[PDB]
Design a protein around this nucleic acid. Sequence first.
DNA 1: AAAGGTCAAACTGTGACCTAT
DNA 2: TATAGGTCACAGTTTGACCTT
Lengths: 84, 85
Amino acid sequence: LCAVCGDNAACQHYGVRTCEGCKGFFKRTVQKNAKYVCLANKNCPVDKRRRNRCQYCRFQKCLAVGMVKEVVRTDSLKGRRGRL
Amino acid sequence: LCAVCGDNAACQHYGVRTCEGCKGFFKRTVQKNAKYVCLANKNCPVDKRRRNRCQYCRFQKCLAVGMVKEVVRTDSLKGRRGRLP
DNA sequence: AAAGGTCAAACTGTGACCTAT
DNA sequence: TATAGGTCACAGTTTGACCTT
Ligand SMILES: [Zn+2]
Ligand SMILES: [Zn+2]
Ligand SMILES: [Zn+2]
Ligand SMILES: [Zn+2]
């Protein structure tokens, strides 16, 4: 189970138990430094089924749970896979 | 000649001579009340070729050039096409 | 002259599965 | 084994040129 939307989560990703959807979403967001805007009141419901209706709230729950921006690899460590 | 992207513009749209690209962009943005974020410093060049590279800057030139949000039809007048008496 | 409608084409994002260590 | 990035069909979104008005 993932800490952001409650889907199946095999292991931790960037510091938090997360599924492979929010894993990639958080990764892509950090990779592109993308910014989102909530069209509601910053409380859109983030479960397995409505996670993708507001990327701001999905990313605002990624940070609330405890996802780490820095664990996503940049600078020297870009395109470097596996452990270190 | 469109005031927002310098493309061909046959007539005015929501107050300003604009192309049908920036027309549809302006209409859709206001209709959906969508909001954008410039990934840069709100300085992206909006030409015919780069207009689609930053939607936030493209909408801030729509407003700077003087297109008016209110001309887009909502409430009573939505789905209403053509001119008005 | 200018409003909304249309929608094929282009464009973009998601995520199950993979490999890398 | 845990967890990093890679892949990329598949899905979802955006665009304007054109059309009806
Ligand atoms: Zn998740
Ligand atoms: Zn939201
Ligand atoms: Zn234009
Ligand atoms: Zn910009």
